[PDB]
Protein backbone atom coordinates (compact mmCIF):
# COMPACT_ATOMS: atom_id res chain seq x y z
CA UNK A 1 0.00 0.00 0.00
CA UNK A 2 1.41 3.39 -1.04
CA UNK A 3 0.61 5.03 2.29
CA UNK A 4 3.23 7.23 3.95
CA UNK A 5 1.53 6.83 7.34
CA UNK A 6 1.93 3.05 7.61
CA UNK A 7 4.75 1.94 5.29
CA UNK A 8 8.34 2.15 6.49
CA UNK A 9 11.17 4.13 4.94
CA UNK A 10 12.77 0.76 4.18
CA UNK A 11 9.50 -0.26 2.48
CA UNK A 12 9.55 2.90 0.34
CA UNK A 13 13.22 2.35 -0.58
CA UNK A 14 12.39 -1.31 -1.33
CA UNK A 15 9.49 -0.37 -3.62
CA UNK A 16 11.67 2.29 -5.28
CA UNK A 17 14.50 -0.19 -6.00
CA UNK A 18 12.04 -2.84 -7.24
CA UNK A 19 10.33 -0.40 -9.60
CA UNK A 20 13.72 0.92 -10.74
CA UNK A 21 14.76 -2.62 -11.73
CA UNK A 22 11.38 -3.00 -13.47
CA UNK A 23 11.90 0.25 -15.40
CA UNK A 24 15.45 -0.82 -16.28
CA UNK A 25 14.92 -4.36 -17.51
CA UNK A 26 11.59 -3.67 -19.23
CA UNK A 27 10.25 -0.54 -20.87
CA UNK A 28 8.29 2.27 -19.25
CA UNK A 29 5.43 2.41 -21.85
CA UNK A 30 5.22 -1.36 -21.39
CA UNK A 31 5.28 -0.78 -17.62
CA UNK A 32 2.45 1.72 -17.95
CA UNK A 33 0.59 -0.86 -20.05
CA UNK A 34 1.17 -3.42 -17.29
CA UNK A 35 0.16 -0.85 -14.67
CA UNK A 36 -2.92 0.67 -16.31
CA UNK A 37 -4.83 -2.48 -17.28
CA UNK A 38 -8.22 -2.63 -15.58
CA UNK A 39 -8.01 -6.27 -14.47
CA UNK A 40 -5.18 -5.65 -12.01
CA UNK A 41 -6.59 -2.35 -10.72
CA UNK A 42 -8.27 -4.39 -7.91
CA UNK A 43 -4.66 -5.32 -7.10
CA UNK A 44 -3.34 -1.83 -7.91
CA UNK A 45 -5.80 0.02 -5.63
CA UNK A 46 -3.45 -0.51 -2.70
CA UNK A 47 -0.72 1.14 -4.76
CA UNK A 48 -3.09 3.61 -6.47
CA UNK A 49 -5.90 4.54 -4.06
CA UNK A 50 -6.86 7.95 -5.53
CA UNK A 51 -8.37 8.63 -2.10
CA UNK A 52 -7.24 10.63 0.95
CA UNK A 53 -5.44 12.83 -1.58
CA UNK A 54 -2.38 13.61 0.55
CA UNK A 55 -1.58 9.92 -0.01
CA UNK A 56 -2.18 10.56 -3.72
CA UNK A 57 0.26 13.48 -3.39
CA UNK A 58 2.71 11.10 -1.71
CA UNK A 59 2.34 8.60 -4.57
CA UNK A 60 2.75 11.33 -7.22
CA UNK A 61 5.84 12.80 -5.58
CA UNK A 62 7.20 9.32 -4.81
CA UNK A 63 7.03 8.11 -8.41
CA UNK A 64 8.42 11.46 -9.52
CA UNK A 65 11.24 11.51 -6.92
CA UNK A 66 12.28 7.98 -7.85
CA UNK A 67 13.22 9.47 -11.22
CA UNK A 68 10.28 8.30 -13.33
CA UNK A 69 7.43 10.74 -13.19
CA UNK A 70 4.92 9.61 -15.78
CA UNK A 71 3.28 6.71 -13.94
CA UNK A 72 1.27 9.11 -11.75
CA UNK A 73 0.07 11.50 -14.46
CA UNK A 74 -3.39 9.96 -14.06
CA UNK A 75 -3.04 10.57 -10.32
CA UNK A 76 -1.89 14.12 -11.12
CA UNK A 77 -5.03 14.90 -13.11
CA UNK A 78 -7.06 13.10 -10.41
CA UNK A 79 -5.52 15.52 -7.89
CA UNK A 80 -6.26 18.36 -10.32
CA UNK A 81 -9.97 17.64 -10.76
CA UNK A 82 -10.68 16.36 -7.22
CA UNK B 1 45.69 39.86 -16.06
CA UNK B 2 44.37 40.18 -19.63
CA UNK B 3 47.76 41.43 -20.81
CA UNK B 4 49.48 38.67 -18.81
CA UNK B 5 47.01 36.14 -20.27
CA UNK B 6 47.76 37.33 -23.80
CA UNK B 7 51.42 36.75 -22.95
CA UNK B 8 50.47 33.40 -21.36
CA UNK B 9 49.00 31.83 -24.47
CA UNK B 10 51.63 33.67 -26.47
CA UNK B 11 53.97 31.39 -24.51
CA UNK B 12 51.62 28.37 -24.53
CA UNK B 13 52.40 27.15 -28.03
CA UNK B 14 54.05 24.02 -29.38
CA UNK B 15 57.59 25.52 -29.32
CA UNK B 16 59.88 22.54 -30.00
CA UNK B 17 63.32 22.43 -28.31
CA UNK B 18 66.17 23.87 -30.33
CA UNK B 19 69.09 21.61 -31.21
CA UNK B 20 71.95 23.16 -29.24
CA UNK B 21 75.69 23.20 -29.88
CA UNK B 22 76.84 21.12 -26.93
CA UNK B 23 74.69 20.76 -23.82
CA UNK B 24 71.24 22.42 -23.79
CA UNK B 25 70.39 25.24 -21.42
CA UNK B 26 67.95 24.62 -18.57
CA UNK B 27 65.01 27.01 -18.30
CA UNK B 28 62.72 27.99 -15.41
CA UNK B 29 59.38 26.31 -14.68
CA UNK B 30 54.93 24.56 -11.68
CA UNK B 31 51.92 24.03 -9.41
CA UNK B 32 50.92 23.89 -5.75
CA UNK B 33 53.16 21.53 -3.78
CA UNK B 34 52.07 21.24 -0.06
CA UNK B 35 49.19 18.80 0.39
CA UNK B 36 47.66 19.06 -3.09
CA UNK B 37 48.92 15.67 -4.33
CA UNK B 38 46.63 13.85 -1.86
CA UNK B 39 43.53 15.43 -3.43
CA UNK B 40 45.17 14.94 -6.84
CA UNK B 41 45.33 11.19 -6.16
CA UNK B 42 41.79 11.25 -4.70
CA UNK B 43 40.22 12.79 -7.81
CA UNK B 44 42.58 10.65 -9.91
CA UNK B 45 40.89 7.56 -8.44
CA UNK B 46 37.53 9.31 -8.83
CA UNK B 47 38.19 9.98 -12.52
CA UNK B 48 39.52 6.45 -13.00
CA UNK B 49 36.37 4.97 -11.44
CA UNK B 50 33.54 7.29 -12.51
CA UNK B 51 32.26 6.89 -16.05
CA UNK B 52 29.57 8.22 -18.36
CA UNK B 53 28.51 7.77 -21.97
CA UNK B 54 27.12 9.89 -24.77
CA UNK B 55 28.47 13.21 -25.95
CA UNK B 56 28.78 16.43 -23.96
CA UNK B 57 25.46 17.49 -25.50
CA UNK B 58 23.44 14.79 -23.75
CA UNK B 59 21.11 16.71 -21.40
CA UNK B 60 18.32 16.83 -24.01
CA UNK B 61 14.92 15.05 -23.90
CA UNK B 62 14.42 15.87 -20.22
CA UNK B 63 10.72 16.43 -19.37
CA UNK B 64 11.65 17.53 -15.80
CA UNK B 65 8.54 16.57 -13.86
CA UNK B 66 8.32 18.72 -10.75
CA UNK B 67 6.64 17.73 -7.51
CA UNK B 68 3.01 18.83 -7.40
CA UNK B 69 3.11 18.84 -3.54
CA UNK B 70 0.38 20.20 -1.25
CA UNK B 71 -1.47 23.41 -2.10
Amino acid sequence: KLSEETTTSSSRIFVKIFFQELCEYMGLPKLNARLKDETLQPFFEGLLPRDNPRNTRFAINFFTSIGLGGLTDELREHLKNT
Amino acid sequence: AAGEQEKLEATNRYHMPKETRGQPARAVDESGAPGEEQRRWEEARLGAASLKFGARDAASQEPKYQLVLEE
Binding site: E4, I13, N61 | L69
Partner: peptide, 28 residues
Protein backbone atom coordinates in the same frame (compact mmCIF):
# COMPACT_ATOMS: atom_id res chain seq x y z
CA UNK C 1 25.06 -1.93 14.95
CA UNK C 2 21.51 -0.60 15.24
CA UNK C 3 22.96 2.93 15.33
CA UNK C 4 24.63 2.29 11.97
CA UNK C 5 21.36 0.67 10.80
CA UNK C 6 19.30 3.78 11.57
CA UNK C 7 22.12 6.05 10.36
CA UNK C 8 22.04 4.29 6.98
CA UNK C 9 18.23 4.46 7.01
CA UNK C 10 18.41 8.22 7.71
CA UNK C 11 21.22 8.85 5.19
CA UNK C 12 19.56 6.52 2.65
CA UNK C 13 17.53 7.51 -0.43
CA UNK C 14 14.66 8.63 1.87
CA UNK C 15 11.72 9.81 -0.28
CA UNK C 16 10.05 11.55 2.68
CA UNK C 17 13.26 13.54 3.29
CA UNK C 18 13.20 14.40 -0.41
CA UNK C 19 9.61 15.63 0.02
CA UNK C 20 10.65 17.80 2.98
CA UNK C 21 13.57 19.19 0.92
CA UNK C 22 11.41 19.91 -2.13
CA UNK C 23 8.56 21.33 -0.02
CA UNK C 24 10.98 23.70 1.72
CA UNK C 25 12.43 24.62 -1.69
CA UNK C 26 8.91 25.40 -2.93
CA UNK C 27 7.95 27.34 0.21
CA UNK C 28 11.23 29.29 0.21
Amino acid sequence: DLDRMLREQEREGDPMANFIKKNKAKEN
